Tab-separated table of C-alpha atoms and ligand atoms in Angstrom:
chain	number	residue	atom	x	y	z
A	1	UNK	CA	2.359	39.238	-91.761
A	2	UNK	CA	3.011	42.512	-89.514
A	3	UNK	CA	6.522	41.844	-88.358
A	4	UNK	CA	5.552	44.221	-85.171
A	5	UNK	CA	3.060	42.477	-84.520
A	6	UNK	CA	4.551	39.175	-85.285
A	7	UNK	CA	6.366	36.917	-81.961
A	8	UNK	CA	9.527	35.165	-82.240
A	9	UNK	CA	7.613	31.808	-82.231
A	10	UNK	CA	5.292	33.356	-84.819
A	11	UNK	CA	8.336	34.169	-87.187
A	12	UNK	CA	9.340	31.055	-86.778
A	13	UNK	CA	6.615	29.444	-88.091
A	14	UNK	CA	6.592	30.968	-91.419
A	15	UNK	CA	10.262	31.148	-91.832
A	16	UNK	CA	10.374	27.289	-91.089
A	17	UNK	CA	8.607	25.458	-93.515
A	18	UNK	CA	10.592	27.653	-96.220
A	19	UNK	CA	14.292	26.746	-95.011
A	20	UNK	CA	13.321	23.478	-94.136
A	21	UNK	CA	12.558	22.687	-98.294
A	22	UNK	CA	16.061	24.374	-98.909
A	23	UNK	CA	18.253	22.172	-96.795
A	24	UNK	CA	16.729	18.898	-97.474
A	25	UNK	CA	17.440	19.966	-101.017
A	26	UNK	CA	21.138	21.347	-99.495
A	27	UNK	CA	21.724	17.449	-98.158
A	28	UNK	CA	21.689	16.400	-101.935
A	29	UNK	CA	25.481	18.107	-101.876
A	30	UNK	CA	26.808	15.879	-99.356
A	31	UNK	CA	25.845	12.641	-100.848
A	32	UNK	CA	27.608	14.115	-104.191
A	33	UNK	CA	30.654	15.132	-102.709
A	34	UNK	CA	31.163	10.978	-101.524
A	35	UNK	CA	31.733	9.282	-104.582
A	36	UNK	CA	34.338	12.292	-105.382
A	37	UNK	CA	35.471	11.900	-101.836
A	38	UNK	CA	38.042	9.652	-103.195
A	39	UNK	CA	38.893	12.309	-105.084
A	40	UNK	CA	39.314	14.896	-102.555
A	41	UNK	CA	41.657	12.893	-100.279
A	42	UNK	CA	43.874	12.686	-103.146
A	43	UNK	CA	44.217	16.255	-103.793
A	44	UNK	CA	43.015	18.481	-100.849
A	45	UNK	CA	43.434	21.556	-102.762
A	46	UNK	CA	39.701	20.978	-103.949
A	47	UNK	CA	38.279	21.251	-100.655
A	48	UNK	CA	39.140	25.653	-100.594
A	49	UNK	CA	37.543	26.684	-104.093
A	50	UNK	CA	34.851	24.755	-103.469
A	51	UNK	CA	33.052	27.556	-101.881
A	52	UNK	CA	34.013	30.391	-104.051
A	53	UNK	CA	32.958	28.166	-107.361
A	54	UNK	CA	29.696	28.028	-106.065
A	55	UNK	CA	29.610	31.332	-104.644
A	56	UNK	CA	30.204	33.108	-108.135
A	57	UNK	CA	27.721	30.925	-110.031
A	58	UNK	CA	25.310	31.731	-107.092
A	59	UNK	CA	25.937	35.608	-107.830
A	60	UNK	CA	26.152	34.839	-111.835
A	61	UNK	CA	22.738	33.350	-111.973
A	62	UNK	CA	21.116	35.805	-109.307
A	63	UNK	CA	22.369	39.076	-111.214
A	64	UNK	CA	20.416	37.252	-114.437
A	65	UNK	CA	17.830	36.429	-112.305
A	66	UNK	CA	16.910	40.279	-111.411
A	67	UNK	CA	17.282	41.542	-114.627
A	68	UNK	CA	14.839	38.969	-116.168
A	69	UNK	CA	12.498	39.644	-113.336
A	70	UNK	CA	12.533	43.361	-113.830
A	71	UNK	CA	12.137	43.243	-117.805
A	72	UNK	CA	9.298	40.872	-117.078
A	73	UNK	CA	7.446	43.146	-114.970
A	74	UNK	CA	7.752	45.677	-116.894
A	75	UNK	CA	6.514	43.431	-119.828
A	76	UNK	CA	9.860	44.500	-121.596
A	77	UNK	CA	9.568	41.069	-122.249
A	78	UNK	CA	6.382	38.395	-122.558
A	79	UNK	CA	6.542	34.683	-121.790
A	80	UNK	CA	6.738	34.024	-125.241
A	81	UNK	CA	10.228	35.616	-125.036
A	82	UNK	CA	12.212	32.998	-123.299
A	83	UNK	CA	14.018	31.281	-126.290
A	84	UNK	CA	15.721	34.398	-127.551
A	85	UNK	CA	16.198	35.029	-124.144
A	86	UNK	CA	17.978	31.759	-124.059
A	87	UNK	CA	20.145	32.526	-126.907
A	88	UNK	CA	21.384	35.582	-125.755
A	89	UNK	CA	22.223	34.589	-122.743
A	90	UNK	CA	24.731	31.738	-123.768
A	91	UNK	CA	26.667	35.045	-125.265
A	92	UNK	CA	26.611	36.396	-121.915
A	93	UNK	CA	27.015	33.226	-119.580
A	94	UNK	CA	29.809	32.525	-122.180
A	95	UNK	CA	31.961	36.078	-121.615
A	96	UNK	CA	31.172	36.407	-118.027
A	97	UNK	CA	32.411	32.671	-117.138
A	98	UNK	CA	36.102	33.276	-119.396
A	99	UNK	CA	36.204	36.826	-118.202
A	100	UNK	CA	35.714	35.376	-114.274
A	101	UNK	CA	37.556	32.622	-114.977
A	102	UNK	CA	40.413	34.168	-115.619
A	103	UNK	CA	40.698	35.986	-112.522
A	104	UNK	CA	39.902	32.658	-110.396
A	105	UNK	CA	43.056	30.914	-112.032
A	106	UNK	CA	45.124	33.599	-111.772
A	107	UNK	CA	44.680	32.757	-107.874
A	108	UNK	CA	45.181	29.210	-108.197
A	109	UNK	CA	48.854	29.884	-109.553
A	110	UNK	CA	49.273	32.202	-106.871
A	111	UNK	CA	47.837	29.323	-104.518
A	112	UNK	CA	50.274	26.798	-106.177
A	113	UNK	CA	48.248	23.629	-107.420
A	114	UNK	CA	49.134	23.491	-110.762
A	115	UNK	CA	46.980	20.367	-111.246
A	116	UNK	CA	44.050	22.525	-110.233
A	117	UNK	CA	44.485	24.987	-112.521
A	118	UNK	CA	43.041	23.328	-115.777
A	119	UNK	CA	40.659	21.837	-113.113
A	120	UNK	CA	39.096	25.005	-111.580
A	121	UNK	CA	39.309	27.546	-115.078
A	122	UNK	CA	37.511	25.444	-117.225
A	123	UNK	CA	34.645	24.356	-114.342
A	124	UNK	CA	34.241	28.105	-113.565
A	125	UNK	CA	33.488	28.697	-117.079
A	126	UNK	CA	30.985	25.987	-117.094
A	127	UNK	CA	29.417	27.063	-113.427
A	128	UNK	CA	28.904	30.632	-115.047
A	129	UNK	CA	27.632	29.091	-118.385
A	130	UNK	CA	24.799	26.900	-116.432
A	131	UNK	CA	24.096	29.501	-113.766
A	132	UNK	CA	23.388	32.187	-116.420
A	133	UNK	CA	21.034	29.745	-118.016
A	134	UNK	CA	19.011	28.717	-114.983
A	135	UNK	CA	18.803	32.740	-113.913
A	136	UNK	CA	17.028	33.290	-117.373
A	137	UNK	CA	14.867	31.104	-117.337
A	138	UNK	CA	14.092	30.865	-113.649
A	139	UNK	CA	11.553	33.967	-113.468
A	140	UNK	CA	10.156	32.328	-117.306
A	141	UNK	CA	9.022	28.840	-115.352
A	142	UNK	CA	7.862	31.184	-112.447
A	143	UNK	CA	5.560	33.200	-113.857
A	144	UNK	CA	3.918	30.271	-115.721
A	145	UNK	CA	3.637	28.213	-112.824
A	146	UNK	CA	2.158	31.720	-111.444
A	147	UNK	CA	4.215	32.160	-108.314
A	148	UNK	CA	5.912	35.755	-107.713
A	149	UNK	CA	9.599	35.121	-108.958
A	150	UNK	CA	10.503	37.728	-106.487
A	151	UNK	CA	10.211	35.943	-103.313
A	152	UNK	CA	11.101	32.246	-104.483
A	153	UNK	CA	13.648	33.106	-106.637
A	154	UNK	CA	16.828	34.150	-105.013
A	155	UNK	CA	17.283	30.774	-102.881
A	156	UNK	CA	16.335	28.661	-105.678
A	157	UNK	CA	18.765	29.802	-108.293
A	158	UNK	CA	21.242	29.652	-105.512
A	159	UNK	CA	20.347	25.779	-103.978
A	160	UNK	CA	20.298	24.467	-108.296
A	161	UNK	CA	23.770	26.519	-109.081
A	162	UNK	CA	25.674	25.283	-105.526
A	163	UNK	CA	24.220	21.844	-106.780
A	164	UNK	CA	24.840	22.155	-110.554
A	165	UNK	CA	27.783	23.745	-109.349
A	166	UNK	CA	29.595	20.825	-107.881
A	167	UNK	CA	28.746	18.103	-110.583
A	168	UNK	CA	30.873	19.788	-112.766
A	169	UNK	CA	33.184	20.642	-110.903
A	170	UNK	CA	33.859	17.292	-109.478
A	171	UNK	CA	33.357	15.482	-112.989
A	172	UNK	CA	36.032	17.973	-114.457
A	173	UNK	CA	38.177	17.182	-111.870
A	174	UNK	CA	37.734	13.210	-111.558
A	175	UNK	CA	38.188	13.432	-115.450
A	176	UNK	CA	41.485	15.641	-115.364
A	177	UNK	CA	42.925	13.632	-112.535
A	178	UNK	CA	41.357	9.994	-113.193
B	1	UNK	CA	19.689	49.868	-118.838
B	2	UNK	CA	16.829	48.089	-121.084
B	3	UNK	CA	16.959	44.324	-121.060
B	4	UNK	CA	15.703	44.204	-124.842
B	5	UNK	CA	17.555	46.940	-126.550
B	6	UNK	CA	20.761	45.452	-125.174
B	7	UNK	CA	23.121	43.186	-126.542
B	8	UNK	CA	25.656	40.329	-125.507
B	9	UNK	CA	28.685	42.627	-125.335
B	10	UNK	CA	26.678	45.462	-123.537
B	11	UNK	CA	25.229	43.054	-121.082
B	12	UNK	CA	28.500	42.125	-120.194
B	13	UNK	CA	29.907	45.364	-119.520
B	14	UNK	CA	27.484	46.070	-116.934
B	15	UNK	CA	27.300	42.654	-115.126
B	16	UNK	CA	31.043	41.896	-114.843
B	17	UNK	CA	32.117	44.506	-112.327
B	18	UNK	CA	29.845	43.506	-109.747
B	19	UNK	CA	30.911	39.672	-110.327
B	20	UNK	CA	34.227	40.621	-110.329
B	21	UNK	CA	34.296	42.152	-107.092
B	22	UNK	CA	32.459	39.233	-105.574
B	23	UNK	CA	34.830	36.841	-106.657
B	24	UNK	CA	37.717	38.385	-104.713
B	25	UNK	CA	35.366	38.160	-101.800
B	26	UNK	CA	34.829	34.606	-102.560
B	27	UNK	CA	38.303	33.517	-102.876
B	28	UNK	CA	39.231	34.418	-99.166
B	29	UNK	CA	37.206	31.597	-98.500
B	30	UNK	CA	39.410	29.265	-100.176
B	31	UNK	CA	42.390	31.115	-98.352
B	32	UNK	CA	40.367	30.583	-94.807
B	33	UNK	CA	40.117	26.639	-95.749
B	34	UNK	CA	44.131	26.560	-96.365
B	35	UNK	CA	44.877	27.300	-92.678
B	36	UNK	CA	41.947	24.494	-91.353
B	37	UNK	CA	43.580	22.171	-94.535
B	38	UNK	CA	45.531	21.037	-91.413
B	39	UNK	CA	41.988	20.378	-90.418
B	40	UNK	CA	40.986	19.399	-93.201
B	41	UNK	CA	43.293	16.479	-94.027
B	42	UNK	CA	42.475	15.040	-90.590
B	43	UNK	CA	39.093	14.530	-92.133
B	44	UNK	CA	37.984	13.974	-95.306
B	45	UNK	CA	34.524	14.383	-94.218
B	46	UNK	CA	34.983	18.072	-93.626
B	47	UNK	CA	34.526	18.913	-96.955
B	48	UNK	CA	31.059	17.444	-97.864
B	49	UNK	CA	29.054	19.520	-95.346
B	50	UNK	CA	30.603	22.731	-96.198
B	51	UNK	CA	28.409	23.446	-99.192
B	52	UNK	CA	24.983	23.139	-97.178
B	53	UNK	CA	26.068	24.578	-94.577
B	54	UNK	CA	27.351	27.746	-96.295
B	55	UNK	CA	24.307	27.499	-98.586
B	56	UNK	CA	21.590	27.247	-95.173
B	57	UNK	CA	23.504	30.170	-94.004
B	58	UNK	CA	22.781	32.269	-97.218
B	59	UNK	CA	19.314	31.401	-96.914
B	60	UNK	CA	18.374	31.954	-93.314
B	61	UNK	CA	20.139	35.539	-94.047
B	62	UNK	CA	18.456	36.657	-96.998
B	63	UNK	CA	14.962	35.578	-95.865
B	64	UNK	CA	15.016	37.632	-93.105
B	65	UNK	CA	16.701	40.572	-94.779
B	66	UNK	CA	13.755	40.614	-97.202
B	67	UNK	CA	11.528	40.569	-94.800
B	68	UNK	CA	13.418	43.617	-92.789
B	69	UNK	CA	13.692	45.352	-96.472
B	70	UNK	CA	10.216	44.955	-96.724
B	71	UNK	CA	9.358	46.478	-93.313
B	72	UNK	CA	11.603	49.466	-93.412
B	73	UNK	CA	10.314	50.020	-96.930
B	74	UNK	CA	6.827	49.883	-96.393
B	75	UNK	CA	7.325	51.757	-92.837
B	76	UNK	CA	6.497	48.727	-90.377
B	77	UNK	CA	9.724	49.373	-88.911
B	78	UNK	CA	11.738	52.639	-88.213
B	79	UNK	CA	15.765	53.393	-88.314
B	80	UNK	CA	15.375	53.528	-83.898
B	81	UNK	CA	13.866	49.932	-83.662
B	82	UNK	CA	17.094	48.172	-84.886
B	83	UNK	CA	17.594	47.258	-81.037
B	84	UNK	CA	13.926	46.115	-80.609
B	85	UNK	CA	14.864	43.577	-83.907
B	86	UNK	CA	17.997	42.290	-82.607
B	87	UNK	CA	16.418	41.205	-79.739
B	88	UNK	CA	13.878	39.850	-81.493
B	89	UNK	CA	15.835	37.482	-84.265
B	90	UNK	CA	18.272	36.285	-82.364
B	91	UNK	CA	15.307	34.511	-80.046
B	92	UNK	CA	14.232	33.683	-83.682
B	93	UNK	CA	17.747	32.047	-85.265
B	94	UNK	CA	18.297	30.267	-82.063
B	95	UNK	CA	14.507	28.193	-82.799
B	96	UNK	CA	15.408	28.150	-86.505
B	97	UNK	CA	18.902	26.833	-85.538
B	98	UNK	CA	18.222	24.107	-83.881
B	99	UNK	CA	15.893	22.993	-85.936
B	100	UNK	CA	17.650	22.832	-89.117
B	101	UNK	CA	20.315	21.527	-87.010
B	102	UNK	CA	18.308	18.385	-86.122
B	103	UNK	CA	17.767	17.869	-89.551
B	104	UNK	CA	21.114	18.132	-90.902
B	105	UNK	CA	22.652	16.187	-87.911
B	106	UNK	CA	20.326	13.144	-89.228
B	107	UNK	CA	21.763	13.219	-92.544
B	108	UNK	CA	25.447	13.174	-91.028
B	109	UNK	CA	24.272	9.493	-89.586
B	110	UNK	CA	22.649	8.520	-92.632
B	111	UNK	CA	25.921	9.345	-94.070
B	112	UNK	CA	27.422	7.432	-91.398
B	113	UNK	CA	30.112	9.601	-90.098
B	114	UNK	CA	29.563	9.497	-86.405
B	115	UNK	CA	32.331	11.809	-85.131
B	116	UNK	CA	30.888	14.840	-87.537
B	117	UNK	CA	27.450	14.711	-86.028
B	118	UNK	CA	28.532	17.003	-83.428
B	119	UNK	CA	30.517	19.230	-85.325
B	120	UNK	CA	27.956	19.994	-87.902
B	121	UNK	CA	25.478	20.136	-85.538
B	122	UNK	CA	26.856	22.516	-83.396
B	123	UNK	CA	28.042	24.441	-86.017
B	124	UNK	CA	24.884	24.352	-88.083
B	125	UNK	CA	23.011	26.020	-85.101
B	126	UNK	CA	26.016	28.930	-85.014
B	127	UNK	CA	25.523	29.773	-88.632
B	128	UNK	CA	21.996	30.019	-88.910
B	129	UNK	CA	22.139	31.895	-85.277
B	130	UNK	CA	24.314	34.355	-86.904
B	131	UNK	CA	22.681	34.958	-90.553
B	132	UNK	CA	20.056	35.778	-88.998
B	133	UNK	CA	21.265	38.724	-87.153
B	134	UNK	CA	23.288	39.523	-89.953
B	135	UNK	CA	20.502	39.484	-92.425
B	136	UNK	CA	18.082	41.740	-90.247
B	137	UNK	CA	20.673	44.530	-89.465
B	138	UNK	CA	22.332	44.823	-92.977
B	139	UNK	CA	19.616	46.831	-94.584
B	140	UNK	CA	19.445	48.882	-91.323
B	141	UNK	CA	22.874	49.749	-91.799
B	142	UNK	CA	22.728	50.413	-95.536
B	143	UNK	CA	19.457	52.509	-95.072
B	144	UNK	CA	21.982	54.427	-92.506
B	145	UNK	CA	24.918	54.660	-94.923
B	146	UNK	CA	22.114	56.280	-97.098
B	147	UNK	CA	21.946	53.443	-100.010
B	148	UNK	CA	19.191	51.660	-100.905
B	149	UNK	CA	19.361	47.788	-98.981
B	150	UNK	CA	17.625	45.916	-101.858
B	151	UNK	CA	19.388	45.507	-104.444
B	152	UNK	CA	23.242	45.370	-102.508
B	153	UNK	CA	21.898	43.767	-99.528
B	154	UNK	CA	21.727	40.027	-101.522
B	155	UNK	CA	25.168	39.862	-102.663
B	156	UNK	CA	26.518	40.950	-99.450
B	157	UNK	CA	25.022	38.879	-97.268
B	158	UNK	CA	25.671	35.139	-99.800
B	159	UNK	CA	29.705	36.294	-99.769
B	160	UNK	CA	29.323	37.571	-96.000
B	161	UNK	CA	27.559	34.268	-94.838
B	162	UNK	CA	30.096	32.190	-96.966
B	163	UNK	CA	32.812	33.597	-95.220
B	164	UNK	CA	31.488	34.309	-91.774
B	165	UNK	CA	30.096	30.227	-92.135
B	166	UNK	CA	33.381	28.982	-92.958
B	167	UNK	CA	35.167	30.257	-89.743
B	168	UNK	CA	32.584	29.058	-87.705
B	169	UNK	CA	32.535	25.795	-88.837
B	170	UNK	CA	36.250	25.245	-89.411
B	171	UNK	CA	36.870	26.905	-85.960
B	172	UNK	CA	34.260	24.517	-84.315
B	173	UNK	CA	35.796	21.346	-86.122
B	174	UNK	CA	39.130	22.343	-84.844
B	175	UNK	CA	38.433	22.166	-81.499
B	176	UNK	CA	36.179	19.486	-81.145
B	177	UNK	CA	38.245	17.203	-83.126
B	178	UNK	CA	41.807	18.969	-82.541
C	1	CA	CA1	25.911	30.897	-101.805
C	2	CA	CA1	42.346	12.298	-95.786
């Protein structure tokens, strides 16, 4: 595992295996996005916050993510610990998802889709909620199953909250506008 | 700060800066899709693919930014070889492109959209081409600008690939499919 002594091909072959896991898992978020297809030719407007939903519950649950990870290492906190852990953090998922979803809506009214606007503050609250959540107790599961959370981590709390992401997101909005 | 001794309101102080700035990030992406919603509305189909492909991105980049953090940290590499890396990844994205690329492209026909299985497949190979680069030279430049890569270099790249994934793919899809 030298990278100067490592070859392209070499790199390649590590690297590989890894991504490959990620995207077959990635191809899950097409299939959901067709049965609210329907729902997305009605209203384009969906299509653009889309990314940025996901995007902020990727960074929400990463930031919790690190923290746990750190505390955990530096047995701040035990395995045992998880549950309080878990309480706590709906406090925090809970703030950071109004706090953030207030700025996100304020955008939508600038945008212009009023319909979106009940449809996009409440989901971001939710994507925030959930993402906190999974951060948490990410690095928990992790060190039980006795894997580093260090290196495993980051792209899995990112593929579950992109996928968690857009249920609710898309269930919010068939419900609002259905 | 210590995970333990801190509580819901303090933990939200500290973490809703950082999310707050990467949410502004994250909504020019919805901006970027307004333009292409010319695009867009030509076909539906846009929007399904733009999740995985965004999210393959963010992997590819952060994978090999650990690995370069990891390097530069434990001295494998020096601030001088950025040239001798760039060389080297790009040979390595353009493998790790197209095969991702060959896997995605088979799930565009199991969707059965036809006319996207170029698209996405060209595309697919562009994004993973370029978070690759991006991911390798980020924590050279950081290291450079004299703060430490780790912790920053995550964020960065998720919004940077997010954006920087979207204009490829939109850009592609426009002229392929006009
Ligand atoms: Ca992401
Ligand atoms: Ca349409």
């Amino acid at each position: 595992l030298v990278y100067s002594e490592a070859g392209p091909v070499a790199l390649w072959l590590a690297r590989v295996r890894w991504l490959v896991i990620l995207i077959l898992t990635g191809m899950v978020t097409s299939s959901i996005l067709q049965g609210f297809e329907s729902v997305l030719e009605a209203v384009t407007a969906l299509a653009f916050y889309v990314p940025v939903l996901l995007g902020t519950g990727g960074n929400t649950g990463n930031q919790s993510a690190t923290l746990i990870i750190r505390a955990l290492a530096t047995r701040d906190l035990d395995l045992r610990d998880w549950r309080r852990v878990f309480l706590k953090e709906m406090g925090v998922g809970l703030l950071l998802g109004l706090t953030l979803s207030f700025l996100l809506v304020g955008k939508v009214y600038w945008d212009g889709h009023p319909l979106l606007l009940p449809v996009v503050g409440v989901s971001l609250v939710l994507i925030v909620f959930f993402a906190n959540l999974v951060g948490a107790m990410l690095p928990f599961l992790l060190r039980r199953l006795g894997v580093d959370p260090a290196l495993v981590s980051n792209p899995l709390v990112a593929t579950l909250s992109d996928v968690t992401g857009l249920l609710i997101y898309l269930s919010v909005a068939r419900l609002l506008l259905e």
